[PDB]
Every structure is written in structure tokens, then in C-alpha cells.
Amino acid sequence: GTGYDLSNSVFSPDGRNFQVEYAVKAVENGTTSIGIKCNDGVVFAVEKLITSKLLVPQKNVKIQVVDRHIGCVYSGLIPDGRHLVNRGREEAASFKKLYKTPIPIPAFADRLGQYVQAHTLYNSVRPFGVSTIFGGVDKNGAHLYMLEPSGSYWGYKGAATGKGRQSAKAELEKLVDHHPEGLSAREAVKQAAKIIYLAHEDNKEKDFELEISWCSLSETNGLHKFVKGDLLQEAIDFAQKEIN
Amino acid sequence: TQQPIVTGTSVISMKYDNGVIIAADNLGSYGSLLRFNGVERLIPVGDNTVVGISGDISDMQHIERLLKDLVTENAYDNPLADAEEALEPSYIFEYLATVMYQRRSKMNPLWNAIIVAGVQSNGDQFLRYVNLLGVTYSSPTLATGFGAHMANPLLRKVVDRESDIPKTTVQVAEEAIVNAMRVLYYRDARSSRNFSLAIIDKNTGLTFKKNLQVENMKWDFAKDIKGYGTQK
Numbered sequence: 001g002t003g004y005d006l007s008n009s010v011f012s013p014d015g016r017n018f019q020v021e022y023a024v025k026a027v028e029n030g031t032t033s034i035g036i037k038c039n040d041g042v043v044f045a046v047e048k049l050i051t052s053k054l055l056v057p058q059k060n061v062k063i064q065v066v067d068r069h070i071g072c073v074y075s076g077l078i079p080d081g082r083h084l085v086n087r088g089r090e091e092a093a094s095f096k097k098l099y100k101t102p103i104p105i106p107a108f109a110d111r112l113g114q115y116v117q118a119h120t121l122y123n124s125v126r127p128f129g130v131s132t133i134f135g136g137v138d139k140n141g142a143h144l145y146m147l148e149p150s151g152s153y154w155g156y157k158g159a160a161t162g163k164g165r166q167s168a169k170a171e172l173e174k175l176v177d178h179h180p181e182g183l184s185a186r187e188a189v190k191q192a193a194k195i196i197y198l199a200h201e202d203n204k205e206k207d208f209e210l211e212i213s214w215c216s217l218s219e220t221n222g223l224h225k226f227v228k229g230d231l232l233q234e235a236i237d238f239a240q241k242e243i244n
Numbered sequence: 245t246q247q248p249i250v251t252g253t254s255v256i257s258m259k260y261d262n263g264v265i266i267a268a269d270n271l272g273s274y275g276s277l278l279r280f281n282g283v284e285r286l287i288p289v290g291d292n293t294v295v296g297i298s299g300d301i302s303d304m305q306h307i308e309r310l311l312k313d314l315v316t317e318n319a320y321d322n323p324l325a326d327a328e329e330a331l332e333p334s335y336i337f338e339y340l341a342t343v344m345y346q347r348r349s350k351m352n353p354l355w356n357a358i359i360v361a362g363v364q365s366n367g368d369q370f371l372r373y374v375n376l377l378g379v380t381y382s383s384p385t386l387a388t389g390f391g392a393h394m395a396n397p398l399l400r401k402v403v404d405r406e407s408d409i410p411k412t413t414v415q416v417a418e419e420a421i422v423n424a425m426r427v428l429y430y431r432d433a434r435s436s437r438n439f440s441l442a443i444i445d446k447n448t449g450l451t452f453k454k455n456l457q458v459e460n461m462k463w464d465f466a467k468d469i470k471g472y473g474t475q476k
Binding site for chain 2: 058059060061063064065067068089092093096097100226
């Protein structure tokens with residue numbers, strides 16, 4: 001309403017920053033983005049909508065890499081989403097030089113959430129308008145976070161954001177109940193795809209493109225790499241099979 | 245103003261018809277004391293280039309992260325880049341040239357003698373020298389340091405000019421590399437028996453052999469020799 005927005009660092013008598021909550025409103029309007037934790041990896045899946053037949057698909061991603069082992073995928077406004085991964089990239093690089101070991105996955109969550117926080121702290125600069133699901137495999141195993149534009153991060157077994165986030169979490173809800181273990185890496189590829197099919201029944205106007213990436217201990221060798229080919233076809237056949 | 249502390253000695257290399265051979269002894273020498281042994285000189289950068297470094301081990305490690313970060317950077321800002329806009333020797337070579345020149349002009353250089361050897365995306369052999377000074381030249385045979393003087397004239401028989409690259413095979417080149425290593429073990433006090441040897445090919449890729457030894461070490465003429473020149 002009126003008062004205590006116009007700025008993002010002015011409290012109200014309810015203790016709540018208005019501008020920042022509208023930051024979360026921006027993330028809803030963006031595309032359906034999900035990430036799945038497994039006990040040996042992590043799998044990232046995305047709905048990159050097809051906005052024309054003049055678009056070139058699977059050549060514009062919302063997947064980005066951090067170091068060579070941390071996957072990232074964003075919801076919200078697309079170039080804001082670029083900018084925050086860029087920050088990630090400078091920290092990855094810097095940490096790796098000084099200590100000569102990769103960025104730990106818990107270490108990463110702390111550091112990102114703090115830049116988000118320096119921009120919610122000053123009245124003068126805007127906050128971020130994107131969420132970032134991220135994680136990978138390191139020496140202390142797989143771990144998965146989702147970072148809110150509010151300044152907050154938590155561990156998750158399955159994290160979802162975007163418009164079709166209501167449907168995707170409902171499917172993820174089955175995934176936790178049914179496997180306490182978070183599911184094997186291989187089946188979670190075909191799973192990651194299924195959820196995005198059922199969640200594009202809320203962005204049904206347009207066409208979509210599924211791109212999948214993963215980081216797995218014994219199958220992507222602790223490093224991040226794209227999922228392609230026969231594996232990709234299978235994730236598609238599986239999703240398809242079960243929407244029908 | 246820097247003085248080197250622990251230094252590596254010598255890198256030898258030459259062209260062949262299907263790639264390049266880069267090799268050097270494994271050693272960290274603190275002056276008179278041969279302090280550190282098994283100190284890997286050859287850092288592979290991607291899998292289509294090996295970058296060899298002799299000189300200061302301090303600046304060796306420092307470059308080792310910056311090259312690994314050069315690939316990590318290539319992955320950044322693109323959907324693919326490891327075969328799509330694949331990495332080339334040419335990028336490394338100039339990256340290294342700019343940095344060492346800038347640091348030398350700030351009067352606190354990077355103290356190395358560098359051989360970049362790989363095969364391009366075009367497949368054309370790339371073999372070029374870069375150093376603290378900022379010197380750059382491309383030659384059919386290269387060697388750094390002491391090997392520059394000593395072992396290189398042996399490699400210059402095998403290939404004289406640049407139009408004599410296709411007459412050397414992988415077998416011919418390698419046999420000569422071993423011969424150059426034999427010379428260096430003998431008559432350099434800061435060479436070591438141990439050596440690593442990377443063979444870069446365009447139709448096969450990287451085979452990297454570790455911990456080879458010099459064979460056919462001749463010393464049976466030494467028993468016969470007596471005195472300092474005159475034996476009373």
C-alpha cells in the first residue's frame with residue numbers, strides 16, 4: 001500500500017519489508033524451475049518456454065555453471081538472474097586460488113546469501129529479483145539449497161520455484177514420502193522431466209523446452225555436465241507416458 | 245626486484261607430422277641442494293595442449309591455478325565451449341605473454357621459461373616460447389634454459405627448417421627426445437634421471453607418460469680413464 005515501501009529497508013509496524021515481498025512476486029512470474037537432491041547427486045530441470053518458432057531452443061538456457069561442479073538454475077527475471085550467478089563465479093574463482101581446494105557446498109550458501117543481504121540492507125539500492133537453486137557434489141557429498149531474494153537459504157530435498165511451483169512441489173512431495181533417500185540419480189533424471197510436464201499445465205499457452213543438467217558422484221564424476229542424448233530422450237518418454 | 249629461490253631446469257621439444265613432443269626432467273633445485281624430487285613441470289591444459297614450465301617453482305604453481313581457471317572461464321557464459329568453441333594453444337600462449345610482460349614492467353616479474361606445445365583445432369602444430377622478459381618466437385625445435393644451448397643442436401639435425409616437419413615421424417621424434425634427455429642427464433648438474441614426457445597428437449589425443457628413466461647409461465669407459473691426466 002502506501003508507506004514503508006518506496007524503500008526496501010524501512011520496516012512497518014508489522015515488521016515486514018514490502019518492496020522485498022514484491023521481489024518474490026517477480027520470481028512467480030518467471031519460469032518453472034526445479035532441483036532434486038539425491039544421495040549421490042543432484043539433478044536440475046527447467047521449463048524454458050518457446051516464445052516463437054524463430055527462437056532457437058536449447059541454446060538459450062537458464063542453466064549456468066559455478067566453478068566446474070556447482071550447477072545453478074534461476075527463476076525470475078532473466079538478466080538479474082545472470083548477474084547473481086556472476087557474483088558466484090568470482091567467489092568460486094577467488095576461493096579456489098587462495099586455499100587451492102573447491103568451494104564447499106555449505107560455504108557457497110552462506111556467501112551468496114550475504115550479497116543478497118547487503119542489497120536489502122540499504123535503502124538506496126534495489127534487491128535481487130530472482131531465486132537460485134543450486135548445489136552439486138563436493139568432498140562432503142551432495143547438498144542442495146534454494147536461496148530466496150528475501151536473503152534466506154535452507155537445505156532441501158526438493159525445491160521448486162516459478163509459476164507452476166504449486167504443482168511441482170506436490171509431485172516432489174511424493175518423491176520425499178516415497179523415497180526417504182531422495183531417489184537414485186538415474187531415475188531422478190526421468191523424474192525431473194515428469195514434474196516439468198505436469199507443471200506446464202499452468203503455462204499451457206506457449207510451447208516449452210526441457211533441458212536437463214546434473215552433477216552426480218559416479219556417473220558425472222563429482223563435476224557438473226549437461227544431460228543429453230539417449231538419457232534425454234528417456235526423460236522425455238517417461239514424463240510423457242505418465243502425463244497421458 | 246626478485247631473485248629465484250627453488251628453480252626447475254630445462255624443457256626440450258620438437259615438432260612431428262601429427263603433433264608435438266614436450267618433455268622435461270622432474271626436479272626442484274634450491275641451488276647446490278637438490279631439495280625436491282618429482283616436481284611435475286608439465287601441466288596439461290585441456291587435453292589438446294600441455295604447457296611446460298621450468299624456472300621458479302613459486303611462479304609455476306601460481307600459473308598452474310591460472311590455467312585451470314582459464315578452462316573454468318571457458319565454461320562460463322556459454323551453453324557449451326569444450327568442443328563448440330574448443331580451447332586452443334594460441335589463447336594460453338598470448339595469455340601468458342601479456343601477464344609476464346606486465347609483471348616485468350612492474351619490476352616484479354613471473355620467473356619462468358615456458359614452452360607451450362599442443363595441436364590446434366586446425367590441427368596444425370603449435371610450438372612457441374615465452375618467458376619473464378616477454379620474448380616470443382616460434383621454431384621447429386625448441387628448448388629452454390641449459391637445453392637451449394646444449395640439447396637443441398642435436399634436435400636441429402633431426403629437423404633443420406620448418407618444411408622438414410613432415411619427414412619426422414612420432415617414433416623418430418621420441419627417439420631423439422630420449423637422446424636429448426641422455427645429454428642433459430649427463431652434463432647438466434641440475435638435471436635429474438627422472439623425466440616426464442607428454443606426446444600430443446591430433447588423431448589420438450594426449451598420452452602422458454610419467455616417471456621414465458634414462459636407459460643405456462654409459463660409464464664403462466670410466467674404469468680405463470685414470471688420473472687427472474697424468475698418472476705417475
